[PDB]
């Protein structure tokens, strides 16, 4: 689809068989979810934002589907007051910027 | 034009004289560049995201051209890491994300 930016860009994504809404955000590097349960191994990870540091776990090749498209890969889980969908599973969904 | 996301999408922007990078940002609300001396009033303002809370001066009715896009709104200003060009903005210049 075509999306505006009047409002946040929030999207409906599945992850391990969960519903969440997400923020399509090409200001981040990564993609970084509220706290939850994941599958598999995790090893902690340090990110940063606009107000500092916060510790996240990493689970990688993480199956998440973002309104309908398909993406693999790496997914950082902690204390974000926001889920965030980043650049690098936005890419998997072939996703751009126009104007 | 159109901008992957492979990398950051840093552009250049012009305000208030100068040139600049900064980062097109469909997950900011706001538009925050790094401390610069614009003239007129402000208003103190905080704003947040991962991490934290950062103060900032909020400056009303700033005009930043954006790629050859001009567009006029609420511009703040301090110790942010990246500049960064949010919705605010964005929507003036008729940018959206497509997959
Ligand atoms: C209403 O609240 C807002 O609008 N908050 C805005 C805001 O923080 N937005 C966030 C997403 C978000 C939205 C709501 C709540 C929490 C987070 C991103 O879009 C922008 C930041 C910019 C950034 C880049 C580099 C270093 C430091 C900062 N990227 C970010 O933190 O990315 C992380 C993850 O990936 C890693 O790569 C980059 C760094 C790592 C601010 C920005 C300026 C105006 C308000």
Redesign the interface.
Do not use: S
């Given at each position: 689809?075509?999306?505006?930016?009047?409002k946040?860009?929030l999207v409906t994504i599945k992850i391990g068989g969960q519903l969440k809404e997400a923020?399509?955000?090409?200001?981040?590097?990564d993609t970084?979810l509220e706290e939850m349960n994941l599958p598999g191994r995790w090893k902690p990870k340090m990110?940063?934002?606009?107000?500092?540091?916060?510790k996240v776990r990493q689970y990688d090749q993480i199956l998440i589907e973002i309104?309908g498209?398909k993406a693999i890969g790496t997914v950082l889980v902690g204390p974000?007051?926001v889920n965030?969908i980043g650049?690098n599973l936005?890419?998997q969904?072939?996703?751009?910027?126009?104007?």
């Open positions: 689809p075509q999306i505006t930016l009047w946040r860009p923020l399509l955000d090409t200001g981040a590097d970084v990110i940063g934002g606009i107000g500092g540091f916060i309104c498209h974000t007051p965030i650049r936005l890419t969904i072939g996703c751009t910027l126009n104007f």
